[PDB]
């Protein structure tokens, strides 16, 4: 992977632009497929028996998913006629459309591939791309948020934090914990879509920055809880303070930036006379915190992972924005109260 690897990475960047700037329903289908043909090579890279299994599981669960989207595109020719990504019109078309989006974002009945795909990547650079790919179908949902029946969108949000809040408890694999942290945060994504379109995109701004900081802290190789355990005493001790700060912000805690999306999600929902649904969102949010709480015990507690082998030489990773973005990820509570309006 020499110069052309950047070009392969550029087509994912350009692929989302096609989805972003679009008016035609077949144009976004092209935009989704621009990502399909360009993530798989980075999913493989070194060629491993675990990588072959992950890439096939990533393909089959996602290519069939986009094929359900094309049905809803063709129902938009049978009914309502026009090829515009403004409204879905038909309730018959929306049922197949929302489920196709749930296969990438809703996750509540389509989570199954995520913990196996995220674990299957041999490299840390591939972990960023799956948290960046979720930006693409969110642009579609922001365009067609009316007309779609709320009874079978909010079920994809309520159930997702339940399975996300239980699915990380029996996991020691560091990639797997972050895989279920996606599904847990995706419930908050598919909740603001029926109740006020703004702050839904800001939820991405908080999430993507917070997740990109997380994996770049794991540039010093760690794949399990026990491998991230040997970091405070043997490796760099000051580095684990930033891992602590990012993990505390991942769960809902006020002096950190991660509580600031959770503000407006409940605020806009309570304005629409709904109290019984946002209550369930807050109790299930506690279950999300528990995974980060156990993972902060690799940074706070002793835990005895000393080992005979010791590193003396200074570490030099990639670190693209692993210094500027964690400062925004640790503290942005006072910095961003009126910034909800600035995004959209």
């Amino acid at each position: 992977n020499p110069i052309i690897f950047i070009i392969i990475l550029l087509t994912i960047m350009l692929g989302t632009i096609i989805v972003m700037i679009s008016s035609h329903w077949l144009l976004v289908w092209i935009g989704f497929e621009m990502n399909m043909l360009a993530i798989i090579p980075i999913m493989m890279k070194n060629h491993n028996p675990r990588a072959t299994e992950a890439s096939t599981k990533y393909f089959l669960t996602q290519s069939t998913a986009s094929m359900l989207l094309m049905m809803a595109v063709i129902i938009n020719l049978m009914f309502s006629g026009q090829w515009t990504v403004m409204k879905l019109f038909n309730p018959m078309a929306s049922m197949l459309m929302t489920m196709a989006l749930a296969m990438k974002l809703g996750m509540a009945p389509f989570h199954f591939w995520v913990p196996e795909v995220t674990q299957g990547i041999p490299l840390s650079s591939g972990l960023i791309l799956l948290t960046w790919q979720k930006l693409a179908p969110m642009s579609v949902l922001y365009q067609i948020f009316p007309s779609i029946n709320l009874n079978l969108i909010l079920t994809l949000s309520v159930l997702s934090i339940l399975i996300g809040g239980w699915g990380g408890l029996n996991q020691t694999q560091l990639r797997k914990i972050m895989a279920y942290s996606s599904i847990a945060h995706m419930g908050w994504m598919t909740a603001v879509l029926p109740y006020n379109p703004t702050m839904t995109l800001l939820n991405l701004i908080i999430y993507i920055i917070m997740t990109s900081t997380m994996f770049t802290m794991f540039m010093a190789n760690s794949t399990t809880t026990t491998l991230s355990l040997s970091h405070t005493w043997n490796k760099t001790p000051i580095m684990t303070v930033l891992i602590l700060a990012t993990l505390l912000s991942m769960g809902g805690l006020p002096p950190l930036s991660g509580f600031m999306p959770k503000w407006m999600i409940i605020q806009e929902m309570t304005k629409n006379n709904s109290i019984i649904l946002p209550t369930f969102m807050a109790i299930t949010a506690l279950l999300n915190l528990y995974f980060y709480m156990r993972l902060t015990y690799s940074t706070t507690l002793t835990m005895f992972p000393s080992t005979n082998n010791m590193k003396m030489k200074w570490q030099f990773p990639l670190m693209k924005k692993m210094t500027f973005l964690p400062t925004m990820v640790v503290l942005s509570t006072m910095m961003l109260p009126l910034t909800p309006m600035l995004s959209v």
């Binding site: 028996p49 020691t172 399990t224 026990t226 355990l229 156990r294 002793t302 835990m303 005895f304």
Partner: protein, 46 residues
């Protein structure tokens, strides 16, 4: 202080001891190598 016995509880296996699925072994440190053999390798003709 936490010792080596405490680290073995949070060691790479299942986080939570397995109820039914315990046959699944831990993955390798830097991407697992699968089957070296189980291949044809070079054809023979009469």
């Amino acid at each position: 202080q936490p010792d080596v016995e405490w680290a073995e509880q949070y060691g790479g296996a299942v986080m939570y001891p397995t109820k039914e699925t315990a046959h699944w072994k831990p993955p390798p440190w830097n991407d697992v190598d699968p089957p070296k053999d189980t291949l044809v390798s070079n054809l023979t003709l009469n």
